[PDB]
Amino acid sequence: GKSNVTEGALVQNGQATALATVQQLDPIYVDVTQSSNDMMRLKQELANGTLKQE
């Protein structure tokens, strides 16, 4: 990514702001927000039943 710091700017060890941001985009993660009560029925149903899965 970008540089949290330009050259010459002082830094400390393990300091608060990391300097640059490495990243790996080949894979990626998607956090799916789920309604608490929802997923209940999910297993609630998936044993309910029925429901199913793959």
């Binding site: 330009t6 050259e7 010459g8 700017a9 002082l10």
Partner: protein, 53 residues
């Protein structure tokens, strides 16, 4: 003394170590001076960058 009598190759080696050993300490302190100096003349100017202040 080497090749001469008293040298006792072991003993000369003993000092030569001490040579070897001491000078290492020499290198040690020199850094100590160094660390300090870079901690003394460290101050201050400046952000290796040369620019409008």
């Amino acid at each position: 003394l080497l090749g001469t009598q008293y040298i006792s190759k072991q003993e000369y080696d003993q000092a030569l170590a001490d040579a070897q050993q001491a000078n290492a300490a020499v290198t040690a302190a020199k850094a100590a001076v160094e660390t300090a100096r870079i901690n003394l003349a460290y101050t201050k100017v400046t952000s290796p960058i040369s620019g409008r202040i």
